[PDB]
Write an enzyme that holds these catalytic residues in place. Structure first.
Site, short mmCIF file in Angstrom:
data_model
loop_
_atom_site.label_atom_id
_atom_site.label_comp_id
_atom_site.label_asym_id
_atom_site.label_seq_id
_atom_site.Cartn_x
_atom_site.Cartn_y
_atom_site.Cartn_z
N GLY A 198 12.61 94.77 78.93
CA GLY A 198 12.13 93.80 80.16
C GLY A 198 13.36 94.59 81.26
O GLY A 198 12.52 95.24 82.04
N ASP A 199 14.53 94.11 81.11
CA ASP A 199 15.04 94.16 82.37
C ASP A 199 16.39 95.13 81.94
O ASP A 199 17.11 95.25 82.93
CB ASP A 199 15.89 92.94 82.82
CG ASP A 199 14.75 91.98 83.97
OD1 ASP A 199 14.85 91.01 83.78
OD2 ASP A 199 13.63 92.36 83.79
#
Ligand SMILES: [Ca+2]
Ligand SMILES: [Ca+2]
Ligand SMILES: [Ca+2]
Lengths: 161, 161
Positions: free
Chosen positions: A16-17
């Site tokens: 995700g990040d």
DNA sequence: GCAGACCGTCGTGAGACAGTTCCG
DNA sequence: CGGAACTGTCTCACGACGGTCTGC
């Protein structure tokens, strides 16, 4: 050691990040093949949440280097080198989803590298995979990477192949 | 039905590309208290990676709403209602790190609502929590939400307390 | 009179590298 | 030498909500 739920969480946070990429640096000082292959995974996050990055850092055996501030109020945690990536990755691949493909190409680049580092013909096959990792990280409408094609005309022009 | 490593991944992915928030919807047709409290968790991701959202969706029991395009080339997956969150969130909380607090605060509001529905004073204690959640999703330098300060103004003006 | 679900969006927080310099 | 380690940046992909709008 890394618990299965700690590995799954990081697998999910990374999707995700985080980022799994690969690049080819021009080295003026190298002998025959004037390029370094760099392989990495990172975690990016605003500088206030920094402590959360540190935590993961501890969970992955303090491997890599933390950075409180890139210089735009963002913090990152970067892990380069096949040594660390050959021990960390396999603990995550089973749980990775979005960047699983990436992870497996990196691992593949690692096992082909010892024979490709002093052999232009093999280094070229390795660089082709480098191009796949990079494309996997691009939109369908973006220009595809062209590392192989540029090294092929450079290796021929140089009479290295 | 959710495995501990499946939850951990989702908590990881949620901390990365997801959101845990709460808000006050103005509802003109409501009788005494004309506001709806809304509690939601979401996941956001680029249009081409929709299928990963779906997997999560089938993994959580098909609760909420998938959405292939918000209209800007982006896809999301939102879960409203205390009914779903009272089942999903307890399965995530123990693995959540960055948005853990938001979760707990959200479970909190769920405990206080049945009595706050028709009671302006208790709805006010609840709205404080709605401000807390919103504050938690802001930077230290940002303005803090004002939902309690203005609904106390309203409630005195309207003579409700 | 209730609360779901169905349409939009500003202002950043990320991602995926690149240039340069260290290190025994 | 060959790698491990510091710097630094253009360009989106996110996040965290806000209005309507049904269909009871
Ligand atoms: Ca992402
Ligand atoms: Ca994030
Ligand atoms: Ca993100």
């Amino acid at each position: 050691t890394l618990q299965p739920t700690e590995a799954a969480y990081i697998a999910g946070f990374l999707d995700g990040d985080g980022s799994i990429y690969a690049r080819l640096i021009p080295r003026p000082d190298y002998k025959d093949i004037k390029y370094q292959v760099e392989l990495a995974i990172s975690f990016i996050q605003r500088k206030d949440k920094f402590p959360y990055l540190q935590d993961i850092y501890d969970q992955l055996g303090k491997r890599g280097t933390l950075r409180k501030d890139r210089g735009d109020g963002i913090a990152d945690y970067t892990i380069w080198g096949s040594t660390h990536l050959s021990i960390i990755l396999p603990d995550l691949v089973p749980y990775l989803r979005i960047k699983k493909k990436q992870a497996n190409r990196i691992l593949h680049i690692i096992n082909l590298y010892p024979q490709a580092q002093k052999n232009p013909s093999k280094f070229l096959d390795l660089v082709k995979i480098v191009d796949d990792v990079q494309n996997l990280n691009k939109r369908a409408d973006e220009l595809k990477s062209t590392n192989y094609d540029r090294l092929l005309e450079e290796f021929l022009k140089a009479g290295k192949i």
